[PDB]
Amino acid sequence: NAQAEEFKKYLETNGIKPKQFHKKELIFNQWDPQEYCIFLYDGITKLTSISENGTIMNLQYYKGAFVIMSGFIDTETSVGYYNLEVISEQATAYVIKINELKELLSKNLTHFFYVFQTLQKQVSYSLAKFNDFSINGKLGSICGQLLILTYVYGKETPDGIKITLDNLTMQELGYSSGIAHSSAVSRIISKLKQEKVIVYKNSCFYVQNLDYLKRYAPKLDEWFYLACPATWGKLN
Amino acid sequence: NAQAEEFKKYLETNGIKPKQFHKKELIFNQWDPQEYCIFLYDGITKLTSISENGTIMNLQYYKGAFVIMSGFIDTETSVGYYNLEVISEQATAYVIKINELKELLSKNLTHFFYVFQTLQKQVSYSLAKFNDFSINGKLGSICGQLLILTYVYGKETPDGIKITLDNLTMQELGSAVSRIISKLKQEKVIVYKNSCFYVQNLDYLKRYAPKLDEWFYLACPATWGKLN
Ligand SMILES: Cc1ccc2nc(NC(=O)CSc3nc4c(c(=O)n3-c3ccccc3)SCC4)sc2c1
Ligand code: NA
Ligand code: NA
């Protein structure tokens, strides 16, 4: 993506080097008092929260390119005690202290706009998925996640749109939709298999009825059309 | 809130004049091709979406002072087909076409950062609620919004924290929920005291809405302080 690529060059030409991360490592963690701007360039992460008793709550998944900020831009204080965990095999990220980010975005408002609108995408995304979960429950949520994965990682084949994403575990798909006990994930997947919306062949899901997914995750479909029209359009 | 006041003054000095809306009016709506940045100075609004079914879903509640942007700052296209509806009797809001917001914010970045941080508040807020609901189901969820009412509209009284928000608007907000409420009052958390309900056990709400309590501490520290 162009704006991301420009942002990447802006950061590098200002002395910020890319870091390489590996599966299961934390780019930032919930016990660090320093807050950061993470430019996740390539790879997949998840935001997590570890509770009092050690329970791990998976709250949000992100793919590069994207901007995750662990602290408020103005106060530089924490927006929440969260970790950012790499779930792809490796990931490339630029880690900027928030105070350094303010100075960087201050000097080029084109990049300020890019980061601002990334936040706007996150806001409307959470609203869209709450909208879909409120109407259709876990089915809307699972349909939404599958739709997003289909738009981002889909490859049309004679067997349907192949979700070309490795390590796409059922519980990993469950977590990304908001479902901890994988009882519900396997069940919803069974309804979608029975109604021929998806098949699971080789190691991937193949979407056979995109219209069905869009029908039960309509607000997330609209979110993708408004936020990423060029990606939405490739499969519409 | 100080950044908000300075933002209000910054808008007025640049000609932006506020408008008072009344309950059920739409400050912006899902059918308008033009997008807006709303500085909600005073009052209570809800973000709604009217589905194809004709169903009206309540997605978010906003209280002044706060900023709600119906369109992307760069592209000026919609972030979603949403309405912003007034649920307080009146509300004061500054309505800025998003074209103009870009120039307003470029001139003074202190206010750019203010608007930027309202977005971060929304993002973290949604994740905090999702965390509580995923751990404690509907109990966390109920506890969460009882916690919100307690913090935003809580007065220390002899009988606990009286929810001081006008009960005219309490209805807007409000299945298995009846049972959850009964166990609440059953377990003394909230007391039915002549239709003036009181929160008698903040620690219980805090216990089952922990990530939302943390969000208030981190995002609204003055508000969080009063009842802690
Ligand atoms: C193993 C596993 C499991 C689930 C999963 N989900 C993935 N991808 C996504 O969830 C889409 S990435 C994304 N997330 C968000 C926003 C966003 O803009 N994106 C995004 C980024 C780049 C391109 C398209 C969408 S705003 C708030 C969350 S991977 C992934 C990998
Ligand atoms: Na941290
Ligand atoms: Na609109």
Author numbering:
A (entry chain A): 2 to 237
B (entry chain B): 2 to 175, 184 to 237
Sentences reproduced from the published study:
Expression of these L. monocytogenes virulence genes is controlled by positive regulatory factor A, PrfA. PrfA belongs to the cyclic AMP receptor protein-fumarate and nitrate reduction regulator (Crp-Fnr) family of bacterial transcription factors. Transcription factors of this family bind a wide range of ligands and are activated by allosteric communication between the ligand binding site and DNA-binding helix-turn-helix (HTH) motifs. Reduced glutathione (GSH), a low molecular weight thiol important for intracellular redox homeostasis, is thus far the only known allosteric activator of PrfA.
To verify and elucidate structural details of PrfA inhibition by IWP-2, we determined the crystal structure of the PrfA:IWP-2 complex at 2.0 Å resolution. The asymmetric unit of the PrfA:IWP-2 complex crystals contained one PrfA dimer composed of monomers A and B. Difference Fourier and Polder electron density maps unambiguously confirmed binding of IWP-2 to PrfA in monomer A, at the AI site, but not the BI site in monomer B. IWP-2 bound at the AI site with mostly hydrophobic interactions, as well as one direct hydrogen bond with the side chain of Gln146, and one water-mediated hydrogen with the side chains of Gln61, Tyr126 and Gln146. The ring-fused pyrimidone group of IWP-2 was positioned at site S1 in the vicinity of the aromatic side chains of residues Tyr126 and Phe67. The methyl-benzothiazole group of IWP-2 was directed towards, and pushed on, the first helix of the HTH motif. This resulted in a shift of the helix and folding into a structural conformation similar to that present in the GSH-activated PrfA structure. However, the binding of IWP-2 likely prevents the collapse of the N-terminal PrfA domain, a process otherwise necessary to line up the folded HTH motifs—one in each monomer—in positions compatible with palindromic DNA binding. As a result, in the IWP-2-bound PrfA structure, even though it is folded, the HTH motif has a position not compatible with DNA binding. In the PrfA monomer B, where no IWP-2 bound, the HTH motif was not folded. IWP-2 was 2.6-times more potent in inhibiting hly expression of L. monocytogenes in liquid culture compared to the recently described bicyclic 4-(1-naphthylmethyl)-2-pyridone PrfA inhibitor, KSK67 (15); IWP-2 IC50 = 0.026 μM versus KSK67 IC50 = 0.067 μM.
